[PDB]
Paper text:
The eponymous PQS (Pseudomonas quinolone signal, 2‐heptyl‐3‐hydroxy‐4(1H)‐quinolone) and its biosynthetic precursor HHQ (2‐heptyl‐4‐quinolone) are both QS auto‐inducers acting as agonists on the transcriptional regulator [name] (also referred to as [name]). Among the various possible drug targets, [name] is particularly attractive, as it is the essential transcriptional regulator of the PQS QS system serving major functions in PA virulence. Blocking this receptor results in affecting a number of down‐stream regulated processes such as virulence‐factor production, e.g., pyocyanin, biofilm formation or eDNA secretion. Due to its central role in virulence regulation, [name] has been investigated in various studies as a promising new target for treating PA infections. It has been shown that small molecular agents, which act as inverse agonists on [name] and thus inhibit QS, are able to reduce the production of the important virulence factor pyocyanin and the auto‐inducing alkylquinolones.
It became evident that the para‐substitution motif was suitable for growing. This was surprising, as this direction seemed to be occluded by residues Ile186 and Leu189 in the X‐ray structure and modeled binding mode. Nevertheless, we installed a number of substituents having various chemical properties in this 4‐position (shown in derivatives 9–15). Indeed, this attempt proved successful, as we discovered phenoxy‐modified compound 4, which showed a highly improved potency at IC50 of 11 × 10−9 m. The exploited growth vector was further endorsed by a co‐crystal structure of 4 in complex with the ligand binding domain of the transcriptional regulator PqsR91‐319. Herein, we observed the opening of an additional pocket upon binding. The para‐installed phenoxy moiety causes a 4 Å movement of Ile186 as measured by α‐carbon distance. Such observations of receptor flexibility and induced fit reshaping of the ligand‐binding site are fascinating and likely the reason for the observed non‐additive SAR. Optimized lead QSI 4 demonstrated high potency, suitable PK for pulmonary applications, a favorable safety pharmacology profile and was well tolerated in mice. In a murine lung‐infection model with a mucoid PA isolate, we successfully demonstrated the target engagement of the QSI 4 by recording a significant reduction of the proximal biomarkers HHQ, PQS, and HQNO.
Numbering used by the authors:
A (entry chain A): 91 to 301
B (entry chain B): 93 to 300
């Protein structure tokens, strides 16, 4: 419970999003400790009763977890990228099958079983533990991948990466960011104050890109 | 020649009209077909439906002859009669919901996408939103309804929301556009997308 709030935030949440969630927690709760995992292992980690994790902020959806409630905290944007001379830039156009005929570089779990959300499309798949690794193989020409905006922002501008999804969803694949909280927190007014403020600031931050 | 566009009933009317007004700028014959969201993807997959475009909230990755693209967004609410048990507590999990009866859209077949598949094993199927809400008023169950379908009755007080702590403003729902691959070349289509998208975006931000 609040004694030591332990919060897990996956690596697809962007720094701005994280640092915002941090402010509000430290403002409403009074011991806070943070854990980071790739989206692969968010839900796995919180399910081990071992990990005593009170709140978890992740893009991965599991409709109902044992001890945990689900709400939607905000949104974030992810891009299909490849190397500029990759063949899927050759093609002007893409469907989700033009892709599955090529090597996808995909996040993997320590388990090896995958959410519907993080399920690879292709069967030409190759698997990596984190996004830096993923981007290293994409950058070298090995396949395509699905990464957060903030991880490919710089390299897209620089031309060292290309984007295949702008026809699919101009601006980015909008990905909900779920907040899974413990039952203990249901009752807590502080957690409800935290939802209010975080939502409101994440909203401000997110709408603020259109200035 | 005849552009057969399909539009499920979760697409708000302003959304449909925006699509009509934009197709008319680049097409001279255009058929508009409505279907429940539970039957859209089935309808296009039938081979002799000659459906060129389908606008719908239901999702699949790969469909036979069909590209996919995200056209916009829309908002949907878990609703319930106000004196329903659920209203009185606060709802933090979908497990409090699966314990009551759900008034869901039933399928022409019986198979349902992940999105439109009911939650409870306590389910009551219907064929349109009109019906789903007659029941939910009468007190029979809770259900998920397009935002426009419940706007006025949430003001009446006829009807209550259970989603507002889940996702305030409403459960954000993507509206996909599945388009025959004959359309990927044609300038007409791509300017439809560009203008439909621009207009739908102006339309959604206008709520503030
Ligand atoms: O989080 C949101 C919470 C509420 C919200 C409400 C509306 S509301 O106007 O309809 O009430 C709209 C939006 S919106 O910005 O997504 O439309 C939101 C939110 N979206 N926030 C963000 C979008 C994209 C990015 S990104 O850089 O990582 O791609 C963000 C990065 C850091 C922090 C927030 C981001
Ligand atoms: O369609 C959208 C297309 C682009 C878009 C871009 C941003 S962008 O700022 O990130 O670039 C934001 C948004 S947004 O408003 O959803 O954030 C959108 C869109 N959303 N449109 C709508 C939302 C909710 C409702 S409804 O509740 O009455 O059904 C709508 C009803 C009719 C027509 C459009 C609706
Ligand atoms: F990076 C990240 F945040 F961790 C992240 C976010 C995720 N979001 C979930 C999701 C992924 N897709 C999607 C997949 C492929 C695609 O390809 C095309 C299809 C049709 C036309 C053109 C291209 C377009 C969309 N949509 N939603 C998933 C994984 N990883
Ligand atoms: F109306 C409509 F557009 F046709 C439509 C849209 C759909 N969208 C898909 C979807 C539905 N849910 C969702 C389901 C229940 C829910 O209940 C709670 C859970 C936890 C806390 C509180 C309440 C919250 C969210 N999330 N995504 C699906 C079907 N039908
Ligand atoms: Mg949005």
């Amino acid at each position: 419970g609040p004694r030591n709030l332990r919060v897990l935030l996956d690596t697809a949440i962007p720094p701005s999003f994280c640092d915002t969630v941090s402010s509000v927690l430290l403002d409403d709760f009074n011991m806070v400790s943070l854990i980071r995992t790739s989206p692969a292992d968010s839900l796995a980690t919180i399910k081990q009763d071992n990990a005593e994790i009170d709140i978890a902020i992740t893009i991965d959806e599991e409709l109902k977890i044992s001890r945990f409630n689900q709400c939607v905290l905000g949104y974030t944007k992810a891009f299909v990228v490849a190397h500029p001379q990759h063949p899927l830039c050759n093609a002007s156009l893409h469907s989700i099958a033009s892709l599955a005929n090529y090597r996808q570089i995909s996040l993997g779990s320590r388990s090896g079983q995958h959410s519907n959300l993080l399920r690879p499309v292709s069967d030409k798949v190759l698997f990596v533990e984190n996004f830096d690794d993923m981007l290293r193989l994409v950058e070298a020409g090995v396949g395509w991948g699905i990464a957060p905006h903030y991880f490919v922002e710089e390299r897209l501008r620089n031309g060292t990466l290309a984007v295949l999804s702008e026809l699919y969803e101009p601006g980015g694949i909008d990905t909900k960011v779920y907040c899974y909280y413990n039952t203990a927190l249901e009752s807590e007014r502080s957690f409800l104050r935290f939802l209010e403020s975080a939502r409101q600031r994440l909203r401000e931050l997110g709408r603020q890109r259109f200035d």
